[PDB]
Amino acid sequence: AICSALPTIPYHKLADLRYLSRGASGTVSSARHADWRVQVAVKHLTPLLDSERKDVLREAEILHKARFSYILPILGICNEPEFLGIVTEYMPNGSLNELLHRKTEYPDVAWPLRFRILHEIALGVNYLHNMTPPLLHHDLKTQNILLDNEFHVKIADFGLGTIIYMPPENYEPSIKHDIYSYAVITWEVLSRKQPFEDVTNPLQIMYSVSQGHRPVINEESLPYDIPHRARMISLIESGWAQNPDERPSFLKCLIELEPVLRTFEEITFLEAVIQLKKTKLQ
Amino acid sequence: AICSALPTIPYHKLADLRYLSRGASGTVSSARHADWRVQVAVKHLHLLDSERKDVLREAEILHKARFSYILPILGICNEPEFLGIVTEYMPNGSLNELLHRKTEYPDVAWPLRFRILHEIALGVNYLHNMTPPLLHHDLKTQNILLDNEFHVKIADFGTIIYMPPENYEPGQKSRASIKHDIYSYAVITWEVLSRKQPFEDVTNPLQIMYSVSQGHRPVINEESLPYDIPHRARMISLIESGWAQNPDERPSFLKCLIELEPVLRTFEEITFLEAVIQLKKTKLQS
Ligand SMILES: CCCS(=O)(=O)Nc1cc(-c2cc(-c3ccc(N4CCNCC4)cc3)cnc2N)ccc1OC
Ligand SMILES: CCCS(=O)(=O)Nc1cc(-c2cc(-c3ccc(N4CCNCC4)cc3)cnc2N)ccc1OC
């Protein structure tokens, strides 16, 4: 009964555009609003076909209808004959991929921060699932997860390399789908390692996973230093099971994770974040 | 063209309710969601149809003003047994507590105070630049909640200090004015740079109303506002122009944001987190 219309931001109110990152889904730039006096990110894509506009609008309204504390907050759409793009909050620290694999800038990443990030990811995906109707991500990657000033998760890219996160039952030309990806991410988050490093052709990855093989679980990929190691390992291995029905919903995962995050003090999170900024500063 | 329906949260999905604080605008409790697995705050009642209509008005105003510094509403609980607004849980409470709880919060680094002022101005300016412009007309340190990282979140669109004189007799038809809000902001800025109660010496609020209608404002001196305050002169000019006897002399929030940006720009990004962690540590162990 209570509807809210996504504001249409005029293009000429967006100053200081700068290419932030290009990718398959389009190009993302940074800008600042003339009236709101705040920084924002803009995702855009020749003239515009009607299908392209329809897909961009689908994505924008999906962001608008799934507003949650850990879902990328959309601010408005810029829809003009000259330009068309989605406006959202600017996430300075970029994607989780950079955080994980930029060991020069990010030498250490305290376990409290890693687990808080995992928890917020699960929370975002679970809220998307608990919508009506249930909203399916169908494409979770360490590149979709953006991190704000305090390294809090913000998920993006919900609507219609990238093979690491695909369940085996999709090779043959669902809710469980998403959890699979999540499991993988957890692995890639506790190890800071590329899944299937030794494999050079992605079809090798597809073959190994279709044979029921997953990334290595050993002493090197996951050190014993990792907190709550055994629970995380059980969660991961059951979360990427060959059979979809055996994979748990995100609510079971949240119930399993909450006591894990509960062992970290509130201040240790900020300590890890500020230590990360300091190691990156020096 | 893009509509978004506020989810209707069932009452039975709110577990572990606890009276957090009662007040004029109603009572706010804390609770936890069964499916979303997150903590939330719930504003509830003490029901006529007029009350329900007003609650729906508040809910739709919060939902239509979704902004980074506006209290994020999650859903509405509309059942015959209960009716309430559900929003994000702001653990550290309101700005008033931060300012005047010197036991838990002995020191408050200037970077964080300026971040809070900046975010307040940003939220109010966003409210003004809407279509149509939405007026707060009741800004106080109790409306400003503080999230996990002490980021400002405005809500709710001895409490007269933040009301301009032309609003005491509410000329609603005549002077439901834009400048009103800026007045409030000025006062808060003072109370944020001094950590002191405006009109401390006055004990009767009607005396405060008379004095303010007489063109009197809080004192600006060496004690209320020490010279230690960063950018002291610029902030003092902002305050004095924000509570001018004449409403038209008070600037829009866009002018204030344009003046504040260069001030916030002088603090490095890490100093904010350092001040916040210092606040969290001083509040602990006490
Ligand atoms: C294909 C669309 C990307 S996305 O799939 O992740 N989604 C999506 C994302 C964003 C967004 C992105 C970023 C960002 C900034 C810097 C960097 N790095 C440093 C500079 N060089 C490259 C690496 C990485 C990411 C910040 N803030 C945002 N708000 C904005 C809108 C979006 O709309 C779906
Ligand atoms: C009480 C003012 C109402 S309000 O004017 O600020 N508006 C409004 C606010 C809220 C809200 C409030 C709180 C909150 C938490 C701790 C405390 N303290 C601790 C115990 N001692 C007293 C002080 C006070 C408030 C947290 N999170 C929320 N989300 C929820 C809905 C609202 O309705 C729009």
DSSP string for chain A: --EEEPPB--GGGEEEEEEEEEETTEEEEEEEETTT--EEEEEE--PPPHHHHHHHHHHHHHHHHT--TTB--EEEEEE-SS-EEEEEE--TT-BHHHHHH-TTT-----HHHHHHHHHHHHHHHHHHHTSSSPPP-----TTT-EE-TT--EEB------TTTT--GGGS---HHHHHHHHHHHHHHHHH-S-TTSS--SHHHHHHHHHTT--S--STTTS-TTSTTHHHHHHHHHHHT-SSGGGSPPHHHHHHHHHHHHTTS-HHHHHHHHHHHHHHHH-
Instruction: Locate the chain A residue with the closest alpha carbon to B5.
Output: A3
B94 in a labelled binding site: no
What single letter denotes the amino acid at residue B247?
A: P
B86 forms beta bridges with B42, B75
State the Cα–Cα distance between residues A89 and B67, nearest whole angstrom: 10
Write out the two tokens for A182: 């999540």
- Residues of B marked active site are found at 138
State the Cα–Cα distance between residues B256 and B33, nearest whole angstrom: 39
Residue pair B100/B195 in contact (Cβ under 8 Å)? The answer is yes
Strands A84-89 and A74-79: antiparallel
Q: Which ligand is located closest to the Cα atom of residue A91? A: 1
State the Cα–Cα distance between residues A137 and A280, nearest whole angstrom: 32
State the Cα–Cα distance between residues B135 and B144, nearest whole angstrom: 15
What single letter denotes the amino acid at residue B190?
A: W
Q: Determine the 3-state secondary structure of B68 from DSSP.
A: coil
Q: How far is Cα of residue A152 from the mean position of the Cα atoms in its chain?
A: 11
Active site residue A139: yes
B27 forms beta bridges with B22, B44
Question: Of B258, B136, B148, B126, which Cα lies nearest the Cα of B188?
Answer: B136
Nearest CA to ligand 1 atom 3: A28
The residue segments making up the domain with residue A230 are 1-282
Write out the two tokens for A192: 């800071």
Q: How many CB pairs under 8 A join A and B?
A: 107
A113 touches B at CB < 8 Å:
no
A148 touches B at CB < 8 Å:
no
Write out the two tokens for A156: 């993006």
Question: Of B174, B147, B149, which Cα lies nearest the Cα of B87?
Answer: B147
State the Cα–Cα distance between residues B80 and B11, nearest whole angstrom: 10
Contact B37 A251 (CB under 8 A): yes
State the Cα–Cα distance between residues B218 and B200, nearest whole angstrom: 9
B76 touches A at CB < 8 Å:
yes
Say yes or no: CB of residue A93 within 6 Å of ligand 1.
no
Question: Of A217, A215, A222, which Cα lies nearest the Cα of A181?
Answer: A215
Method used to obtain the model: X-ray
Residue pair A56/A86 in contact (Cβ under 8 Å)? The answer is yes
Residue pair B16/B31 in contact (Cβ under 8 Å)? The answer is yes
Backbone angles phi, psi at A208, to 5 degrees: -65, -40
Say yes or no: CB of residue B23 within 6 Å of ligand 2.
yes
State the Cα–Cα distance between residues A96 and B228, nearest whole angstrom: 41
State the Cα–Cα distance between residues A63 and A19, nearest whole angstrom: 22
- CA distances B200 to B36, B82, B197, Å, are 45, 41, 5
Nearest CA to ligand 1 atom 32: A43
Q: HSE (CB half, 13 Å, CA atoms) of B143?
A: 21
Residue pair B79/B11 in contact (Cβ under 8 Å)? The answer is yes
Place of tokens 């999540």: A182
What single letter denotes the amino acid at residue B77?
A: C
Active-site residue among A139, A157, A178, A245? A139
Contact B2 A150 (CB under 8 A): no
User: What was the resolution (in A) of this experimentally determined structure?
Assistant: 3.3
Q: Give A169 to chain B, closest Cα distance, Å.
A: 27
Residue pair A92/A40 in contact (Cβ under 8 Å)? The answer is no
Residue pair B250/B241 in contact (Cβ under 8 Å)? The answer is yes
What single letter denotes the amino acid at residue A168?
A: P
A66 in a labelled binding site: no
B132 forms beta bridges with none
Write out the two tokens for B37: 């697995």
Place of tokens 């350092």: B274
Instruction: Locate the chain A residue with the closest alpha carbon to B125.
Output: A36
Question: Of B137, B156, B152, which Cα lies nearest the Cα of B28?
Answer: B156
Instruction: Locate the chain B residue with the closest alpha carbon to A77.
Output: B2
Domain count, chain B: 1
State the Cα–Cα distance between residues A180 and A223, nearest whole angstrom: 22
Question: Of A272, A4, A221, which Cα lies nearest the Cα of B5?
Answer: A4
* CATH code for the domain in which residue A6 is found: 1.10.510.10
Q: Determine the 3-state secondary structure of B223 from DSSP.
A: coil
Give every strand in the sheet of A39-44, ordered side by side. Answer: A14-23, A26-33, A39-44, A84-89, A74-79
